[PDB]
Amino acid sequence: KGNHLVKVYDYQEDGSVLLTCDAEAKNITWFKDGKMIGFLTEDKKKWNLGSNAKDPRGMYQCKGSQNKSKPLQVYYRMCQNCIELNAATISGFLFAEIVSIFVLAVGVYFIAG
Amino acid sequence: FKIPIEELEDRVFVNCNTSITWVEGTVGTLLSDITRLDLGKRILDPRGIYRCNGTDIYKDKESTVQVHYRMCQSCVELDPATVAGIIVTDVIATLLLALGVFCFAGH
Amino acid sequence: QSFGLLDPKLCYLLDGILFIYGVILTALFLRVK
Amino acid sequence: LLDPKLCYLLDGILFIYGVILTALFLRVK
Amino acid sequence: GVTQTPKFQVLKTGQSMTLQCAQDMNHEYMSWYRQDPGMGLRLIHYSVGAGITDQGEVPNGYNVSRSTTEDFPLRLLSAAPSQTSVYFCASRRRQGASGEQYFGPGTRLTVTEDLKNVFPPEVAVFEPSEAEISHTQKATLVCLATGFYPDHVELSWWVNGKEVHSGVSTDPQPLKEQPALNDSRYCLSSRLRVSATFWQNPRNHFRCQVQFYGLSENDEWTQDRAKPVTQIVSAEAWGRADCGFTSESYQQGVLSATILYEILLGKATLYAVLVSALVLMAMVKRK
Amino acid sequence: QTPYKVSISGTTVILTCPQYPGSEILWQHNDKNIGGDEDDKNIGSDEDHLSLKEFSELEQSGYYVCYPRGSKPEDANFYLYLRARVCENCMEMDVMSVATIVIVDICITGGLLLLVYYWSKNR
Amino acid sequence: QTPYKVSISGTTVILTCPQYPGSEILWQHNDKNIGGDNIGSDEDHLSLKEFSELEQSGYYVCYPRGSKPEDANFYLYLRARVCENCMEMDVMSVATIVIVDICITGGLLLLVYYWSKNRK
Amino acid sequence: QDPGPLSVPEGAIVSLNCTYSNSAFQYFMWYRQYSRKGPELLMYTYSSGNKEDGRFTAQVDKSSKYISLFIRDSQPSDSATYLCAMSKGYSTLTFGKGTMLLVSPDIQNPDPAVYQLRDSKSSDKSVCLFTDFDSQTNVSQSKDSDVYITDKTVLDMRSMDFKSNSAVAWSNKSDFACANAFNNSIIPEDTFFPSPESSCDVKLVEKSFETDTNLNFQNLSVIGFRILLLKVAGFNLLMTLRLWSS
Ligand SMILES: CC(C)CCC[C@@H](C)[C@H]1CC[C@H]2[C@@H]3CC=C4C[C@@H](OS(=O)(=O)O)CC[C@]4(C)[C@H]3CC[C@]12C
Ligand SMILES: CC(C)CCC[C@@H](C)[C@H]1CC[C@H]2[C@@H]3CC=C4C[C@@H](OS(=O)(=O)O)CC[C@]4(C)[C@H]3CC[C@]12C
């Protein structure tokens, strides 16, 4: 192909992120950033990255009988720790802020005098 | 002789050639035609034992099937350091009230 | 409809603690005056 | 109701209604 | 059983072609046909024995061969627009004793005069309406693929990374944009009907996929646009609820509650440190 | 009848064939022999158990039988069908358990404060 | 050698390949030629305005001018989701909000402490 | 052999026939070709008689010189093209041209309407949709030249045991509306044209709600922070009552 044989298998029911290596062999080996991270025989042809909410990154290779492949770089950014700024958010923030500093201030006033 | 289970869009169905004899587990729902049984959604975990009867030169035999799901809806992921952290902060807070009382309870 | 571990019964309980506190302070404030 | 805004607004009212009571429970006592 | 290769094929005027037929059930004699609108099946050549080949009914322009007792290829000497048809292959044991044939899956050919007429499709997906949801509580999606030539596509539906076969209906034959002309393009459509409470999830993924067969990597291209080759064209949509309370917003509520209760917890620890230190100073001053 | 027993703890699923008390037990999954041949170090077999370590949901999920050694496999008449989601360090709660932990925590704290109150007035 | 650099700001994704020092850069997305003459190519970047998740996601590659894309060095894969007026929460952005809020309300209480001391 | 479609109601008996005047043949067979596929052998006979295969049965008349076929309990899983065939003891099986056959379903409860589907925002077309009919209805093509109409088809949804009829129309030009679209065809009286006054039920949307593991964990962490506020606030009350009470 041009020694490009790592592909991403996406959009499952659970948020699993899977890689499939294209080699007509058994006992496929996996790597990451140059060092070994895995080892996998037949009846399981797909390495697993976990959920897409943890948004993985990095560089991955696979080799069978012949030499290593060219890499693939994954980059997910699926933000999920995000708050939008509405009227409701800023209004609730300001309201809780004012009433907290007010109650604490009344207390300090009665302590000092 | 298998009994085939088929998963349509969000449901589980039990498909045979004659009527399905319930044994124990989820009751289900008969569809408009007989010989099919609807067990509901997959995430609510249907479980049971069912029993059918044969035709189609498996004729004059009988089998049984058991269904079991664990779609993990009320589960929580947690590490074996986090529980130590949570219990430690709770114990420190209850001892902080425990010191907090009798500084007031002498006066 | 699967709520799993997101029932509103937990949040309403934890407000119930505060509710008990308000009841007791109304009771003592009446039983003084 | 499923929408938990009613539970949190239920918390603040029952939270700011405790201070006033206590404050007025010591003005007489 | 009987197999053949390629499935679809495009070739220009004056360009030869060789298409195969293989067989493994140890029969000996084979045939070739072509099927047309309004004419039926008509024979081209056959070969009752390995080495001896005969003629048929319309053999004008088709060469054959026979090397082994399993292969029986077919060759075209050149191209004409009268060659556009569908070609099948047959198989029997020996010479009128047991009259069972076995056909293959087929092969389509179109023949053009010029390669500057070949185009890939364009796919678009149309989401269901709310009058149908509030009236019958079911939902239908429509996928259109328009403007392609030649007519060598295949359509499919993939809900959450797996194919479906239930609740789907595609047109049998593609329609033409103007049925008055000679070199005219095509169009084609499909449906997916689904219950209402399955569409209303914002976690479900729907897509339509079209496989096109065109040119290859051997052909001159003097035209400005991209060279139309074999590709997949597709179109996606998330499911979505319009009114009501989903699990898109529950995350919003829970995030804002965590950040506010952390802020309040910080302020209260400051005040506790303050009055603890003040009671330490009065405790020093009691003595 | 006599059901199977399926026990899932972490990412390890343990089946239990109940039918035969005095025999050797073989297993099969989607008409392929599993276990008992020293391939699949993750897959172990015991007297009437089957260990499946590092369970996969998409692969390795379907029909499972058990038949004695010395019989045909296609003469069985009771099968299992499982699907399960697994992940490491993942416990399965209830709803009533959380309420028991919360109410018990409040009661322990109230007990400590009453005790230290009256012990403080006796000093 | 040196991977790609993805930089997201608002409804805008901008991504740089600093792999080849000097040439003309040709981009390609899902085996379709992109960049040049919404979507705009700079001399060394590639900017993608008003990003949509389902539309722009998949295999991006930059390769020198006049070469083949089956020889570049390696492909990217991005699957992103952007927002307009959203803010993402680290374990450090939470920390700066809490520490700034404490250090603001740790002075007003001393102002009320001194004003309330020198009243009575 | 007779060409042309023959439209049959569901659950009936189908009659086909081929003539071969005049020769003396022995081997008789039938082939069934679906759309965009290759043929397939169904029934094989060379004597006079009846060789059933279930619901399939043919009859051969040797001196009357015609063959036939009968199908009982006909389904919508039988719409195809049927080719009758015969030959000598030599080669060259000689074929007929086949007869297109259509079977229409049982359509228990109609409710005809013409809907407007939400647009794409990537192509500039609009589509209308005219659904379940009662199977007596004919759909004719457009009179215009920029309004494309398909023919009618049947789909089968086995998750609810239901079936239906459909037809789709689309166009580029303006002044295209879903009340003018199927004007060229005859129509059932009392169809249903919707109003733009929308209606969105809410208790129907709540039966499709999910839960991750992350939502479970985030909700529990909120329940922790509330108990921490109550304990620290109780400490603050006790200390400030110590300093204010003396
Ligand atoms: C110290 C005392 C004054 C405590 C007061 C507590 C109140 C004022 C805070 C605590 C928790 C806060 C809510 C958290 C959660 C939300 C959801 C948010 O809606 S959103 O979905 O558009 O994000 C609107 C603000 C709102 C309602 C907040 C209002 C304000 C809120 C009730
Ligand atoms: C984060 C925040 C919302 C928590 C607040 C908890 C404490 C710090 C607040 C809540 C309510 C506040 C009291 C209300 C009002 C009073 C009455 C006052 O009594 S006075 O006796 O001396 O007449 C003593 C201070 C005191 C107890 C305040 C101190 C400060 C006080 C305890």
XYZ file of N, CA and C in Angstrom, chain H residues 134-237:
312
model
N -53.403 2.058 1.304
C -54.316 0.927 1.033
C -54.148 0.198 -0.295
N -53.042 0.403 -1.018
C -52.565 -0.472 -2.100
C -53.434 -0.499 -3.356
N -54.592 0.147 -3.317
C -55.419 0.382 -4.483
C -54.967 1.622 -5.232
N -54.251 2.507 -4.552
C -53.881 3.805 -5.080
C -52.801 3.671 -6.143
N -52.959 4.413 -7.231
C -51.961 4.506 -8.281
C -51.229 5.828 -8.136
N -49.948 5.836 -8.477
C -49.122 7.034 -8.433
C -48.603 7.282 -9.840
N -48.942 8.435 -10.404
C -48.533 8.804 -11.749
C -47.391 9.805 -11.681
N -46.642 9.905 -12.776
C -45.437 10.715 -12.804
C -45.783 12.195 -12.872
N -44.747 13.021 -12.903
C -44.971 14.452 -12.940
C -45.374 14.889 -14.334
N -46.147 15.970 -14.383
C -46.401 16.653 -15.641
C -45.259 17.603 -15.961
N -44.595 18.110 -14.928
C -43.551 19.112 -15.084
C -42.249 18.444 -15.518
N -41.160 19.201 -15.517
C -39.876 18.670 -15.943
C -38.790 18.862 -14.897
N -39.128 19.426 -13.740
C -38.166 19.649 -12.673
C -38.633 19.082 -11.346
N -39.682 18.279 -11.351
C -40.196 17.635 -10.158
C -40.075 16.140 -10.381
N -39.217 15.487 -9.608
C -38.916 14.076 -9.802
C -39.756 13.258 -8.844
N -40.485 12.285 -9.372
C -41.333 11.417 -8.574
C -40.820 10.004 -8.761
N -40.683 9.267 -7.670
C -40.386 7.847 -7.740
C -41.678 7.056 -7.858
N -41.543 5.737 -7.949
C -42.702 4.864 -7.879
C -42.903 4.396 -6.443
N -43.880 3.530 -6.228
C -44.205 3.102 -4.880
C -43.555 1.765 -4.556
N -43.166 1.595 -3.296
C -42.518 0.391 -2.793
C -43.081 0.034 -1.423
N -42.724 -1.154 -0.942
C -43.197 -1.691 0.326
C -41.987 -1.896 1.226
N -42.087 -1.491 2.495
C -41.059 -1.853 3.460
C -41.664 -2.591 4.644
N -40.810 -3.370 5.299
C -41.207 -4.356 6.292
C -40.380 -4.121 7.541
N -41.005 -3.667 8.622
C -40.285 -3.482 9.877
C -40.703 -4.572 10.858
N -39.797 -5.515 11.090
C -40.080 -6.714 11.858
C -39.986 -6.509 13.358
N -39.531 -5.352 13.813
C -39.532 -5.057 15.235
C -40.896 -4.612 15.741
N -41.843 -4.313 14.858
C -43.205 -4.030 15.280
C -44.276 -4.750 14.486
N -43.909 -5.564 13.494
C -44.814 -6.387 12.686
C -45.843 -5.519 11.948
N -45.313 -4.727 11.015
C -46.007 -3.620 10.374
C -45.459 -3.485 8.967
N -46.287 -3.055 8.015
C -45.791 -2.776 6.672
C -46.596 -1.665 6.010
N -46.050 -1.123 4.924
C -46.451 0.204 4.483
C -46.108 0.423 3.016
N -46.572 1.555 2.484
C -46.308 2.000 1.122
C -45.786 3.430 1.157
N -44.941 3.786 0.197
C -44.282 5.084 0.235
C -44.085 5.578 -1.182
N -43.818 6.872 -1.313
C -43.446 7.532 -2.555
C -42.831 8.865 -2.182
N -41.788 9.281 -2.898
C -40.944 10.415 -2.524
C -40.871 11.367 -3.708
N -40.930 12.674 -3.446
C -40.840 13.694 -4.485
C -39.880 14.795 -4.073
N -39.075 15.285 -5.012
C -38.126 16.332 -4.673
C -37.973 17.285 -5.839
N -37.416 18.463 -5.561
C -37.288 19.518 -6.558
C -36.304 20.579 -6.096
N -35.809 21.348 -7.066
C -34.844 22.428 -6.878
C -35.511 23.795 -6.889
N -36.440 24.006 -7.820
C -37.073 25.289 -8.080
C -37.885 25.752 -6.875
N -38.110 27.059 -6.815
C -38.947 27.633 -5.777
C -40.413 27.469 -6.161
N -41.293 27.949 -5.272
C -42.748 27.761 -5.351
C -43.119 26.280 -5.388
N -42.350 25.461 -4.670
C -42.598 24.031 -4.525
C -43.135 23.784 -3.125
N -44.335 23.218 -3.038
C -44.985 23.014 -1.755
C -45.582 21.621 -1.707
N -45.654 21.061 -0.502
C -46.181 19.713 -0.338
C -47.702 19.635 -0.400
N -48.389 20.668 -0.870
C -49.802 20.542 -1.184
C -50.058 20.484 -2.682
N -49.055 20.807 -3.497
C -49.163 20.867 -4.948
C -48.451 19.692 -5.596
N -47.787 18.861 -4.792
C -46.783 17.931 -5.291
C -47.387 16.722 -5.984
N -48.236 15.981 -5.293
C -48.885 14.821 -5.889
C -50.230 15.204 -6.485
N -50.223 16.253 -7.307
C -51.451 16.795 -7.870
C -51.878 16.002 -9.091
N -50.902 15.489 -9.838
C -51.144 14.750 -11.068
C -51.758 13.376 -10.821
N -51.701 12.865 -9.601
C -52.297 11.572 -9.337
C -53.683 11.741 -8.737
N -54.460 10.662 -8.778
C -55.697 10.638 -8.021
C -55.334 10.450 -6.554
N -56.240 10.843 -5.666
C -55.910 10.891 -4.246
C -57.074 10.328 -3.456
N -56.790 9.715 -2.313
C -57.880 9.426 -1.389
C -58.399 10.706 -0.775
N -59.715 10.767 -0.650
C -60.319 11.854 0.090
C -60.032 11.677 1.575
N -59.914 12.818 2.263
C -59.428 12.907 3.643
C -58.027 12.308 3.784
N -57.056 12.964 3.152
C -55.661 12.838 3.532
C -55.393 13.749 4.718
N -54.125 13.941 5.044
C -53.757 14.723 6.217
C -52.622 15.666 5.845
N -52.925 16.951 5.760
C -51.908 17.964 5.537
C -51.616 18.688 6.844
N -50.395 18.630 7.367
C -50.120 19.189 8.692
C -50.059 20.709 8.673
N -50.334 21.286 9.827
C -50.184 22.714 10.045
C -48.789 23.018 10.584
N -48.256 24.219 10.348
C -46.956 24.591 10.926
C -46.968 24.833 12.427
N -48.132 24.808 13.066
C -48.234 24.909 14.516
C -47.689 23.624 15.115
N -46.452 23.678 15.602
C -45.764 22.480 16.054
C -46.333 21.968 17.375
N -46.068 20.691 17.654
C -46.531 20.034 18.874
C -45.484 19.004 19.277
N -44.895 19.186 20.452
C -43.823 18.333 20.937
C -44.186 17.820 22.322
N -44.640 16.574 22.386
C -44.926 15.917 23.650
C -43.635 15.742 24.439
N -43.752 15.792 25.764
C -42.601 15.786 26.653
C -42.484 14.473 27.417
N -43.606 13.890 27.825
C -43.570 12.601 28.505
C -43.245 11.447 27.572
N -43.205 11.681 26.265
C -42.712 10.699 25.317
C -41.200 10.749 25.194
N -40.595 11.919 25.401
C -39.152 12.070 25.249
C -38.427 11.441 26.430
N -39.094 11.327 27.574
C -38.445 10.817 28.773
C -38.298 9.303 28.794
N -38.888 8.576 27.849
C -38.692 7.133 27.805
C -37.406 6.742 27.096
N -36.602 7.704 26.667
C -35.319 7.447 26.022
C -34.255 8.254 26.749
N -33.760 7.721 27.857
C -32.797 8.419 28.700
C -31.743 7.388 29.080
N -30.485 7.791 29.043
C -29.367 6.897 29.266
C -28.584 7.307 30.507
N -27.454 6.654 30.734
C -26.611 6.875 31.895
C -25.249 6.289 31.583
N -24.214 7.074 31.793
C -22.848 6.636 31.579
C -22.320 6.059 32.894
N -21.017 5.872 33.031
C -20.468 5.703 34.370
C -19.957 7.008 34.941
N -19.619 7.942 34.059
C -19.090 9.225 34.480
C -20.162 10.085 35.113
N -21.408 9.955 34.657
C -22.483 10.707 35.290
C -22.767 10.177 36.687
N -22.669 8.858 36.868
C -22.809 8.255 38.188
C -21.738 8.758 39.144
N -20.487 8.791 38.688
C -19.410 9.236 39.564
C -19.509 10.723 39.882
N -19.892 11.548 38.903
C -19.973 12.985 39.151
C -21.115 13.332 40.095
N -22.255 12.649 39.963
C -23.348 12.854 40.908
C -22.976 12.436 42.329
N -22.248 11.322 42.483
C -21.845 10.942 43.834
C -20.878 11.939 44.460
N -19.959 12.499 43.676
C -19.055 13.501 44.231
C -19.787 14.765 44.686
N -20.888 15.130 44.014
C -21.736 16.213 44.528
C -22.322 15.862 45.897
N -22.847 14.638 46.036
C -23.372 14.198 47.334
C -22.298 14.177 48.430
N -21.017 14.021 48.091
C -19.983 14.184 49.109
C -19.781 15.626 49.551
N -19.728 16.553 48.582
C -19.461 17.955 48.921
C -20.541 18.577 49.805
N -21.790 18.105 49.702
C -22.840 18.656 50.569
C -22.633 18.311 52.054
N -22.251 17.064 52.356
C -21.976 16.663 53.739
C -20.762 17.402 54.301
N -19.735 17.641 53.467
C -18.608 18.446 53.946
C -19.009 19.877 54.315
N -19.905 20.506 53.536
C -20.357 21.847 53.923
C -21.130 21.855 55.228
N -21.949 20.830 55.476
C -22.695 20.834 56.733
C -21.785 20.687 57.948
N -20.763 19.832 57.868
C -19.898 19.669 59.036
C -19.041 20.907 59.305
N -18.466 21.509 58.256
C -17.626 22.686 58.492
C -18.459 23.878 58.971
N -19.675 24.047 58.433
C -20.539 25.133 58.887
C -20.973 24.961 60.341
N -21.185 23.715 60.785
C -21.493 23.490 62.192
C -20.345 23.858 63.117
N -19.108 23.560 62.692
C -17.939 24.014 63.450
C -17.886 25.539 63.565
N -18.201 26.252 62.473
C -18.141 27.715 62.504
C -19.172 28.314 63.460
N -20.397 27.762 63.484
C -21.370 28.173 64.504
C -20.860 27.985 65.924
